[PDB]
Structure formats: structure tokens, C-alpha cells
Amino acid sequence: EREEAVVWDILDEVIREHPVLLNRAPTLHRLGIQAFEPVLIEGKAIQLHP
Amino acid sequence: VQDAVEKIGNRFDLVLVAARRARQMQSGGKDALVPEENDKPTVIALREIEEGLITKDVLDARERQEQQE
């Protein structure tokens, strides 16, 4: 809750190889949900590969 | 994951065997047969399958040997 730096390092090492599922509604076909490797970015919006 | 599915033959069986190996390395005390290189257990298991060290038959044989002992 206090957001220390070592908390950020722990978060970096947690998601190092933890895939995450991205979905957009409507899900017309199975390509509407896909697994990606997360990269932490300073911001509030998800960055998607074109 | 192309090499792993080529060595195993089926993606689903590959997933199951890799999950068993990852749980062995994480929950149990088994060590990796390849250099970890700061990798998660799933990736290490996938690399082991890609190198051909780990398969379903090998896991069954090791489990049988452990049960015998």
C-alpha cells in the first residue's frame, strides 16, 4: 500500500514470465482473447501491438 | 513452443506434461536438468521438453522408480 521501490522490483520479477489474457468485447471468434507477455509502462492505458 | 510440440507431438499432451514437470520443480524438491537462467518453472519445463530430456514416459519411469524406493 505504501508503494516502496522493492515492491516494484518484486512486481517486475513476478510478471517476468507470467502470461496475461487480453480480451475485447464482442468475442466473435477465439482470436478475441489472446495471451501476451506483460511489460510494465508508466501510464493508465494498455498498449496493444498493431 | 514449436520445438516442444514437435518433440511431444500434441499441444495438449505437451501442456499436461509440462505442467506436471513444473509442479514437480515448484511444489516438490526436484531440480531443473537445464540451467535456470532466471526462468519460471513452466518455461524451464518447456525448455527441458525442447531439449528432449523430459517426456511422459520419462516422468512415468521416474515416478515408478520413486515408488519402488
Binding site: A5, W8, L40, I41, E42 | -
Partner: protein, 222 residues
């Protein structure tokens, strides 16, 4: 402080070969990666001193579009092959003449060029042309000068055949800027330079020389 700036702390040089290299520098302040990479690219491509083939004399050939009997390649292809000749000239010599004489059937290569000992050929396996007939011979007189950058034949416009001058040893330079972070500052720049030289110089030495030129140009203001 206002005058303090972040300097690279991780510099990694990876050598693919004796002429190919990749240099990674991190971390850099925001926008400095592009500045340094672009300046280094311009200096290495259009301002690096070096020695290259400029002119050639071929016996029996008057124009670049003329034909010679016994050579598989055309005149322009021979000129292009001559362009890709890594040549080193001893310091203090600007203009040098070398010769290449060979008769027979087979590949006429760069190892058959006779020089004065003040000229070193880095790639003796370089193929200059191909002779098809056993009665065919080639006699060429090549001029090697010292210059800067990439000067083509058109910009430099008797029997003298002009060859595009690749004075700069740099054959290829590319730079990429990726995101690097220290502490919680995620806006830093990491610079990756992929370099390939002709063989006269090592890529790291070429980068050092370009940096030396750029820094010396600013000595009057620092």
C-alpha cells in the same frame, strides 16, 4: 544539480565477426540516444577519412560501355568489383598507383595485384573479374586516393574510368533507441548500434574515431 547528467554505466560490445559488431550503451537521458546515434551515423557515413579506389585504366577499353573480349563480366561489373576493395595506404601518401596483370582462364582476384609495399589489401580473396579464353589477358592500372565519405562517380564528373569511392570504412551502421530505466525513472534511453566495416578498421575503433572527430569539432566552446 542542473549541470549533472546521466552517463552510460553498462556498455556491452558483442563481436559477431572481425568486421561486425553490436554496441549497447545504457542508460542515457531522454532524447540523447537519437542525437548521438544520428551524429555518429552522419560522421561515419559521410565524414570518415579513408582510402578507396577512385580511377582505373583498362587496356583496350575506352568508355564504360565499351566491350572487352575474353572477360565474362562487363566493364561496369568490373568497376563495381573494384569498388569493394579494402585498401590501406601508408600514412603520408595521398595518391598511389597499383597495377594488376593476369593472363589465362579463371578468376582474376585481388591477390594478384602488385603494389609497392605501402598498400595493404585486406581481402586478397576478393574476385575482380573472370577470364574465359586462354588467349585473353587483363592489364589494369588502379588509382587509390585518400578521402572522406562516399563520393560517387557522378559527383566527380582520355580513357579514364571513374569508380565510386567508398572512402569511409563503414559499410553499414544502424542505431536503435529502446526504453531503459533506473530506479523509477522509466523514460531513459538505451542505444544499440549495429556496425559492419570493410576490414580496414574494427567497428569499435571506427566509433571511437567518429566520436573523436565530433568532440574535437566542439573544442572551441567547451
Amino acid at each position: 544539480s542542473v549541470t549533472e547528467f546521466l552517463k552510460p554505466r553498462l556498455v556491452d560490445i558483442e563481436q559477431i565477426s572481425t568486421t561486425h559488431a553490436k554496441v549497447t550503451l545504457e542508460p542515457l537521458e531522454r532524447g540523447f540516444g537519437h542525437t548521438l546515434g544520428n551524429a555518429l551515423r552522419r560522421i561515419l557515413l559521410s565524414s570518415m577519412p579513408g582510402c578507396a579506389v577512385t580511377e582505373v585504366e583498362i587496356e583496350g577499353v575506352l568508355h564504360e560501355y565499351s566491350t572487352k573480349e575474353g572477360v565474362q563480366e562487363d566493364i561496369l561489373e568490373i568497376l563495381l568489383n573494384l569498388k569493394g576493395l579494402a585498401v590501406r595506404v601508408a600514412e603520408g601518401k595521398d595518391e598511389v598507383f597499383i597495377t594488376l596483370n593476369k593472363s589465362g582462364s579463371g578468376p582474376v582476384v585481388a591477390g594478384d595485384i602488385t603494389h609497392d609495399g605501402d598498400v595493404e589489401i585486406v581481402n586478397p580473396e576478393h574476385v575482380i573479374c573472370h577470364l574465359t579464353s586462354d588467349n585473353a589477358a587483363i592489364a589494369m592500372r588502379i588509382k587509390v586516393e585518400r578521402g572522406r565519405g562516399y563520393v560517387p562517380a557522378s559527383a566527380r564528373i582520355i580513357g579514364r574510368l571513374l569508380v565510386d569511392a567508398t572512402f569511409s570504412p563503414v559499410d553499414k551502421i544502424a542505431y536503435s533507441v529502446e526504453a531503459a530505466r533506473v530506479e523509477q525513472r522509466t523514460d531513459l534511453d538505451k542505444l544499440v548500434i549495429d556496425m559492419e566495416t570493410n576490414g580496414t578498421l574494427e567497428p569499435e575503433e571506427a566509433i571511437r574515431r567518429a566520436a573523436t572527430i565530433l568532440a574535437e569539432q566542439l573544442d572551441a566552446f567547451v
